[PDB]
Amino acid sequence: MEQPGLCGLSNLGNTCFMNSAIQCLSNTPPLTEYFLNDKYQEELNFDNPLGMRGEIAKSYAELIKQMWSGKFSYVTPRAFKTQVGRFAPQQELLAFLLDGLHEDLNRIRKKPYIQLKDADGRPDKVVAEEAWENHLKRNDSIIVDIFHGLFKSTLVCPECAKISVTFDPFCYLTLPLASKVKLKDCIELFTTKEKLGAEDPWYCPNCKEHQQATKKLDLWSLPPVLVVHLKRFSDKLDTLVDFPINDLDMSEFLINPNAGPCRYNLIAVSNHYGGMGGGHYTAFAKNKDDGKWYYFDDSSVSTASEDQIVSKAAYVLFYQRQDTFSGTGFF
Ligand SMILES: O=C1c2c(O)ccc(O)c2C(=O)c2c(NCCNCCO)ccc(NCCNCCO)c21
Ligand SMILES: [Zn+2]
């Protein structure tokens, strides 16, 4: 075709999930814009021991420039997949993709060792800000800017009443599934206090001993692009998760009381059809130039209506924060 971004991807074999993942990333406007304006050359990290000397970021840039040139109805991501395979010899490809891009473009030249401190008695605000600052001392890139948020973990040990509060970064949110359910039900279930199994207990440093310490997670800060992975694999759970296309307001789940509005509009959806033993991934994506929705099935690109987006096939959701929309301003 002749419109940039309406470009499919040939199936190199099975390459599970990679094409739909690339389409989700391709239709993440700030990421694609960063690559198309050649802002990535300045930031290529050539001797990061955790990176590919820039080869992942370079191959992704070439692929994205091809997809948004308007010259192709579909291309092959063969060089990109080759580099990704060298970075990750082998599931959730997305974490490895985001990590490969991040390290290839990390502004930190040499990561310093940071001694972990527990929250002690300090306020959540102080400890969260400390953790975010420490993270940026080790990880600072366009991938952090777009995708990273901060979550809280509270572990309470019944043996010695010890409470361990830690704040940790994330680049996507894996949600448990609660029969039809709403997305907010999955978020709510994500933040509920749980009892760790005997198969997965906590090593209490005060006790030098593992056992059933309660664990509860909380969202501290949410990124410009919130990636929400619905945990359908542990047989495959096909529950219809009803999620909004527009105006997802996350503020009720944020425990940072000085946080911003965090309202989101959906931009992409990774679908899976079948089960693990037999399955295929596709994607819905909103095109950044005309605002319409499209369906990407490898090389095939076609028009879509919002009627088709919310289905039980929905597997990963890409949301963009309304205050980060390019060329748009809220009051
Ligand atoms: O491609 C779909 C599919 C679709 O494009 C649109 C709607 C759908 O419902 C499907 C779909 O269900 C599907 C598969 N479903 C499970 C049947 N086999 C499972 C038992 O082994 C199992 C496999 C499957 N993919 C076959 C096409 N892929 C060829 C390249 O790998 C699909
Ligand atoms: Zn203990």
Side-chain angles (χ1 to χ4, degrees):
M1 215 179 284
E2 308 309 291
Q3 178 196 339
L6 299 195
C7 176
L9 292 164
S10 48
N11 209 352
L12 312 188
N14 198 344
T15 188
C16 74
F17 173 65
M18 187 187 62
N19 284 344
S20 69
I22 294 168
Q23 293 289 2
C24 288
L25 295 170
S26 161
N27 296 99
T28 301
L31 191 64
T32 284
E33 281 171 356
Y34 172 92
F35 287 101
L36 287 180
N37 287 304
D38 291 322
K39 305 282 98 178
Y40 69 93
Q41 285 94 328
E42 321 160 352
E43 307 204 303
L44 289 172
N45 193 330
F46 288 102
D47 57 12
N48 186 346
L50 303 183
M52 288 283 299
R53 300 155 194 73
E55 295 309 323
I56 285 183
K58 287 196 295 180
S59 62
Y60 185 83
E62 295 177 349
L63 175 58
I64 280 294
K65 290 188 187 185
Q66 284 181 305
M67 293 172 64
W68 286 91
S69 72
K71 305 181 40 184
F72 313 97
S73 61
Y74 65 93
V75 302
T76 189
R78 185 173 306 176
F80 177 72
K81 160 72 197 154
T82 296
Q83 296 305 148
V84 170
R86 291 200 257 262
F87 175 80
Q90 44 280 20
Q91 314 299 348
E92 182 92 20
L93 175 45
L94 203 46
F96 285 85
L97 292 184
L98 292 169
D99 201 49
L101 290 169
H102 161 62
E103 298 297 355
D104 260 359
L105 300 167
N106 200 342
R107 299 159 184 150
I108 311 302
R109 293 297 145 183
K110 176 157 158 45
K111 306 193 179 195
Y113 168 73
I114 295 193
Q115 176 180 0
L116 184 143
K117 313 170 55 184
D118 205 25
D120 194 21
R122 291 176 304 168
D124 277 5
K125 183 218 199 206
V126 175
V127 183
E129 290 182 358
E130 174 182 281
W132 187 254
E133 177 166 10
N134 289 334
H135 181 57
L136 275 283
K137 274 184 289 190
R138 289 169 53 85
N139 307 273
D140 184 359
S141 77
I142 186 68
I143 297 301
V144 177
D145 298 342
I146 293 171
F147 293 97
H148 287 205
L150 191 75
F151 78 99
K152 176 186 174 191
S153 305
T154 305
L155 275 294
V156 186
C157 178
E159 289 151 335
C160 56
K162 169 65 195 302
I163 309 156
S164 181
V165 166
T166 66
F167 286 85
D168 289 297
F170 67 88
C171 61
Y172 60 95
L173 229 53
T174 301
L175 301 190
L177 279 67
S179 181
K180 187 179 181 182
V181 292
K182 291 172 274 191
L183 176 69
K184 279 164 173 268
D185 292 315
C186 298
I187 305 173
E188 199 84 74
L189 192 67
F190 175 87
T191 60
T192 50
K193 185 187 185 176
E194 164 210 14
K195 329 93 188 56
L196 291 185
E199 192 90 345
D200 176 51
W202 174 54
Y203 183 69
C204 162
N206 189 70
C207 289
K208 284 79 179 179
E209 184 75 299
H210 314 70
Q211 214 49 278
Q212 39 156 299
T214 62
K215 178 176 93 136
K216 179 193 186 310
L217 299 192
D218 283 295
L219 300 173
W220 180 261
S221 66
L222 298 182
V225 174
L226 177 68
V227 178
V228 179
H229 164 234
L230 304 168
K231 193 56 152 193
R232 297 189 181 277
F233 301 99
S234 63
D235 203 65
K236 187 197 178 201
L237 299 148
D238 290 87
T239 83
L240 173 58
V241 178
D242 190 5
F243 50 91
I245 317 300
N246 309 284
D247 298 317
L248 164 65
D249 195 300
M250 295 283 295
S251 58
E252 72 217 66
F253 306 105
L254 280 191
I255 65 161
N256 172 9
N258 292 344
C262 54
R263 196 175 288 277
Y264 289 81
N265 292 345
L266 186 71
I267 55 165
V269 175
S270 171
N271 311 294
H272 174 267
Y273 299 86
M276 179 182 178
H280 180 51
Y281 300 80
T282 55
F284 290 101
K286 192 207 272 265
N287 178 270
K288 69 177 188 58
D289 297 327
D290 63 8
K292 304 180 142 20
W293 281 93
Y294 296 90
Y295 186 72
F296 305 75
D297 191 346
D298 294 322
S299 58
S300 178
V301 185
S302 52
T303 53
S305 67
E306 292 185 7
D307 315 329
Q308 293 177 335
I309 294 175
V310 174
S311 75
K312 62 178 188 283
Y315 174 44
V316 177
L317 318 177
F318 280 57
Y319 283 98
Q320 184 172 353
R321 226 168 60 209
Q322 296 183 353
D323 60 316
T324 73
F325 290 168
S326 184
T328 305
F330 290 82
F331 276 125

